[PDB]
Amino acid sequence: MLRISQEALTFDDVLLIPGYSEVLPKDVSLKTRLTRGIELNIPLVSAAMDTVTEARLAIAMAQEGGIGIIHKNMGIEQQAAEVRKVKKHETAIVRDPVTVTPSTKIIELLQMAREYGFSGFPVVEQGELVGIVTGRDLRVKPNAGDTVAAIMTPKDKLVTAREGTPLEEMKAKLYENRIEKMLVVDENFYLRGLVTFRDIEKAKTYPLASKDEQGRLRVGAAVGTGADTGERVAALVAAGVDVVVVDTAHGHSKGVIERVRWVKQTFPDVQVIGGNIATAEAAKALAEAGADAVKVGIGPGSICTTRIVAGVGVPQISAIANVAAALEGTGVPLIADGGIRFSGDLAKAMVAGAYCVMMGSMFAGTEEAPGEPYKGALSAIVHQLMGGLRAAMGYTGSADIQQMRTQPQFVRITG
């Protein structure tokens, strides 16, 4: 008459059993679903933390084939402006470069300059492009009580490209005119972007980039429950957010359920994820409320505060599986959120039933993450992660993710 439901397993309790395999790791397909209406080419999502996902990494994740969820620890208008950044981003275009103006004194220019760590500035007048100044233009004082009009390259010169021009054509003109900056303009010669030679010499055609119907990069955003949530969700949906995540510690509650329903009935053109949960019953509740995806993870970390401060949690491998089984015929995907420290874990989560996995601290050290163990680019981490998934998929003989989630088997281990 002690009330134990079951024995629950985490990642370190199980291993994947190798199977007959005809497809090589490099040839398996990693494409999956984030929500019933959103598809990722890789099963990766970055977590909604101020140390992890803002616009900068959100972009990176979208380009890599996954998605980022902007964190809410910031003003409403700030969070929506991050969503704007990601939704409006083109590869290497600064679409809002720092500018100057014919009448800005050269004293101000040197000052700016210094403050920013670069020297190239388009000269504008109420949006109209009228000239450009750079480092070369500044190598002599004509003698300084004078302005950018005096040293800038005048309008009649100026190499320009229209907005939406391929980088190649764009690269070609920079070299042929032996210059380093390309000014993007529109049909009225208003300045729409800056594109540098240095920025073109990097970063691909991301053929996996997760894009919306309009060819813009996908992004999500977190929201809590209570009072500003409705106002918050509204600004985020106005910003063009693809998916709204109702992100909480206890997803199996009146307040979370009600809010997921409220979102899905008020903003019918967004996708809604509901979370965190860890049981079958919780899963069915969010599905009924109309959740487009369900997020799985309560006390999934052995030292995490949920376990230790509250004595609450469910080992992730059994949580995921219990939720997977619950959502069977629904078409509602599940995301595995927490407790993954190695790429082996990511494979295990997938075979347990996840459609893709959310990660926090993996990405937290990265070059893209906010501010300032600095792990360098997100490229290497994401590549290693998928590297291991593919290896796992090779061993088990799973050609794609549907198969990986449904067919391989585990051995239970001890120590």
Give the Cα separation of 260 and 254 in Å (integer).
10
Cα 78 to its chain centre, rounded Å, is 16
> 94 is in the binding site of which of a copy of itself, Mn ion, ligand ATP, none (Cβ under 5 to 8 A by kind)?
ligand ATP
Phi, psi (deg, nearest 5) at residue 411? -100, 140
Residue 379 engages ligand ATP in binding (rule: CB under 6 A): no
Q: Is 136 annotated as a binding residue?
A: yes
What's the number of CA atoms in the CB half-sphere (13 Å) around residue 89?
24
Q: Judged by CB, which is closer to a copy of itself: 74, or 304?
A: 304
> 5 is in the binding site of which of ligand ATP, a copy of itself, Mn ion, none (Cβ under 5 to 8 A by kind)?
a copy of itself
Closest approach, Cβ 203 to a copy of itself, in A, equals: 17
Q: Judged by CB, which is closer to ligand ATP: 41, or 91?
A: 91
> 194 is in the binding site of which of Mn ion, a copy of itself, ligand ATP, none (Cβ under 5 to 8 A by kind)?
ligand ATP
CB 67 within 8 A of CB 324: no
Closest approach, Cβ 178 to a copy of itself, in A, equals: 5
From its phi and psi, is residue 397 left (phi > 0), alpha (psi between -120 and 50) or beta?
A: left
Give the interface segment with ligand ATP, choosing from 19-27, 153-161, 270-278, 319-327 (CB under 6 A). Answer: 153-161
Q: Which two tokens stand for residue 193?
A: 């972007």
Give the interface segment with Mn ion, choosing from 142-150, 178-186, 241-249, 267-275 (CB under 5 A). Answer: 178-186
> 120 is in the binding site of which of Mn ion, a copy of itself, ligand ATP, none (Cβ under 5 to 8 A by kind)?
ligand ATP
- Residue 28 burial (C-beta neighbours within 10 Å; 0-12, 13-18, 19+): buried
Taking the alpha carbons of 75, 79, 82, 84 in that order, is the dihedral positive or negative?
negative
Closest approach, Cβ 149 to Mn ion, in A, equals: 22
> 198 is in the binding site of which of Mn ion, a copy of itself, ligand ATP, none (Cβ under 5 to 8 A by kind)?
ligand ATP
From residue 266, give the alpha-carbon distance in Å to each of 252, 260, 271, 312, 321.
21, 10, 12, 33, 32
Q: Is 137 annotated as a binding residue?
A: yes
3-state secondary structure 243-268: EEEECCCCCCCHHHHHHHHHHHHHCC
Residues that are catalytic: 304
Among 81, 112, 186, 197, binds ligand ATP (CB under 6 A): 197
CB 30 within 8 A of CB 42: yes
Q: Is 230 annotated as a binding residue?
A: no
Parallel, antiparallel, or unpaired for β 121-125 and 128-133? antiparallel
**Residue 381: strand pairing partners:** none
Q: Judged by CB, which is closer to Mn ion: 158, or 320?
A: 158
Closest approach, Cβ 134 to Mn ion, in A, equals: 7
From residue 407, give the alpha-carbon distance in Å to each of 20, 173, 309, 317, 398.
12, 54, 37, 16, 8
Closest approach, Cβ 159 to ligand ATP, in A, equals: 4
> 373 is in the binding site of which of Mn ion, ligand ATP, a copy of itself, none (Cβ under 5 to 8 A by kind)?
none
Residues in region 130-149 near ligand ATP by CB under 6 A: 132-137
**Residue 185: strand pairing partners:** 162, 191
Give the interface segment with ligand ATP, choosing from 62-70, 113-121, 351-359, 390-398 (CB under 6 A). Answer: 113-121
Cα 357 to its chain centre, rounded Å, is 13
Give the interface segment with ligand ATP, choosing from 72-80, 177-185, 227-235, 237-245 (CB under 6 A). Answer: 177-185
Taking the alpha carbons of 31, 205, 377, 388 in that order, is the dihedral positive or negative?
positive
Length of the chain: 415
Closest approach, Cβ 216 to a copy of itself, in A, equals: 31
Instruction: Kindly report the number of other CB atoms within 10 A of residue 365's CB atom.
Output: 14
End-to-end CA distance of the chain: 30
Residues in region 110-169 near Mn ion by CB under 5 A: none
Contacts with ligand ATP by CB under 6 A lie at: 92, 94, 97-98, 117-121, 132-137, 153, 157-159, 178-183, 194, 196-199
Contacts with Mn ion by CB under 5 A lie at: 180
